[PDB]
Amino acid sequence: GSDFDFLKNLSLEELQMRLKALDPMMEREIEELRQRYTAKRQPILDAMDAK
Amino acid sequence: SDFDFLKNLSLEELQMRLKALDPMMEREIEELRQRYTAKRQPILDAMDAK
């Protein structure tokens, strides 16, 4: 990403492209985070069921 | 840690370990969302300045 000072000099169509790209990037990041925690929970969950 | 360690702990200890992950996850998700909202603003402002 860039700062406002650089962004303001981009075309409106380039800006809309940049704005739109944030959404799947964000969705990818949160998905990875959720999977990261699922993976953390799994061995604890199994350990509880193994008793 | 690994299942081979966790399997030897009490049910109460394991439940505590599960519950401990919750606010950590909550925090990191909120940080992720704030970072997205942040990234949007200078682009939105750049659009409105033109």
Residue numbers in the entry:
A (entry chain A): 1 to 51
B (entry chain B): 2 to 51
List sentences quoted exactly from the publication behind this structure.
Recent research into cellular homeostasis has shown that the Hippo signalling pathway, which is mediated by mammalian sterile 20-like kinase (MST, the human orthologue of Hippo), controls organ size in animals and regulates cell proliferation and cell death. The MST-mediated apoptosis pathway is controlled by its interaction with RASSF family proteins and the WW45 protein. Interestingly, all three classes of tumour suppressors, MST, RASSF and WW45, interact through their SARAH (SAV/RASSF/HPO) domains. We also elucidated the MST2 homodimeric structure and performed structural and biophysical comparisons of the homodimeric and heterodimeric interactions.
Like the MST1 SARAH homodimer investigated in our previous study, the MST2 SARAH homodimer has an antiparallel helix dimer structure with a short N-terminal helix h1 folded toward h1′ of the dimeric binding partner. The main dimeric interactions consist of hydrophobic interactions of the nonpolar side chains and several inter-protomer hydrogen bonds. Firstly, the structures of the two protomers were found to be slightly different from each other in the MST2 SARAH homodimer, while those in the MST1 SARAH homodimer were identical. Thus, h2 of one protomer had a more linear structure than that of the other protomer. In addition to this difference, the hydrogen bonds between the h2 helices of the two protomers were not symmetric. When we overlaid the two protomers of the MST2 homodimer, we found that the side-chain conformations of Tyr470 and Arg474 in the two protomers differed significantly from each other, resulting in the positioning of the hydroxyphenyl group at the other side of the dimeric interface, while most of the backbone and side-chain structures converged well, with a root-mean-square deviation (r.m.s.d.) of 0.81 Å for backbone atoms and 1.22 Å for heavy atoms. The structural differences between the two protomers in the MST2 homodimer seem to arise from crystal-packing forces. Among the water molecules in the MST2 SARAH structure with B factor values below 25 Å2, only one water molecule mediates an inter-protomer interaction, while six water molecules in the MST1–RASSF5 SARAH structure were identified as mediators of inter-protomer hydrogen bonds.
